[PDB]
Amino acid sequence: PRYLKGWLEDVVQLSLRRPSVHASRQRPIISLNERILEFNKRNITAIIAYYLRKRDPIEYAKYMERYAVGLSIKTEEKYFNGSYEMLRKIASSVSIPILMNDFIVKESQIDDAYNLGADTVLLIVNILTERELESLLEYARSYGMEPLILINDENDLDIALRIGARFIVIFSMNFGEINKENQRKLISMIPSNVVKVAHLDISERNEIEELRKLGVNAFLISSSLMRNPEKIKELI
Template identity: 50%
Template sequence: MPRYLEGWLADVVKISLNRERINKIRERPIYLLSKFIKSVTNKNAIIAEFKRKSPSGLNENRNLEEYVKFMEESGAIGISVLTEEKYFGGSYSDLEKAAKIVKIPILMKDFIVTEKQIDTAFNLGADAILLIVKILTERELINLYEYARNLGLEAIVEVTDENDLKIALRYDFNIIGVNARNLSSLEVNIRNVGKILEMIPKDRIKIAESGIKNKEDIVELKKYGADAFLIGTTLMKDPNKIKELI
């Protein structure tokens, strides 16, 4: 593992390797995130994230059921649920509860490094997973992507810099997320997102992630080709912000 992933990120990856597989029968149909994003007209495609805390200082104790219902009713086209426990306070239980409530795509947001995590995402009702280029080898990225697709799940392939993007563009990944947060320093730089979004071909779905605080940020990111916006901290602090962001 590269040196810049030492510390908390390396720690969370090790924890992910030991996560237990959840074996349950999936009853929820699969809602394709790509179709929901493409169907958006005359508004912004918002993926509202539920997370209880984050290394950057967030610490909210919101009711998950109320939050996801409100986001769906307010027009969000997807829900992202943090399931990583140590640093984000998430749980598989949160994912399972959300899947029983909403009828829009659900993203399992975690540091996915094993097929058993993808099995769990499928079994608990997730429709998409996150694959972070920075923490996977190229072979791992391809294998996990194909494994998810064989289950019918979509995958957001997340990049944070040009080197990540070069890897992602070697393959036919249809959804690419650009994270404004540097995974090593945790600093957020939205300008960097615009720069990378411009490099992504128009035939890919492009999602801007992290650091979005207001409508102006969204307008700016759309100039660079963003098709959807994954927003966590801003909405967790003030759920009513969804109305002005959409």
């Protein structure tokens, strides 16, 4: 990984030490990026719901299976209260795409994702060198997973495009300044053969129409839905 400090350094150091799991996968790959493109052809707004333990998780996942295009599950243990067991139980319970949302810094974590039933993984440009990211991209693709690559800024974008990413998520706040104009700028700079995901707050739902016209294919939510799951219906 790159030079890191503070909690982010701590979580990457712990992630490098994550023991591998010897699990056998219980489902096929249910591709997230491909289902987003299907929802786009069906004119159904494509919302990636989330689970982060801070709500019976299975009942929640089954609710979301009815509405969401996919489900992000936070599996980092020390700071975000996740687990591989929670991922596996949710993935075994539903047939929508599952994104393993963690700090993926070594190949064995992609092995873990595959063996536990996740359909893809998050990769974070700004914690990895370009060569590390390219290698992990290739490794994910060897399991039939197109990873969701997170960009922060134009330097991250340049890396992601140079290595041939086809599935990118863009937020509206630097990883702590919020800038919607900058989010739109980064979205515009991604070619149309890339599946693009915008982070969205539920309060921004009036922007979905325009963001779709600007090329966003799906929306990643990270607040409000666990307290009030039915809010996903109004996004859609």
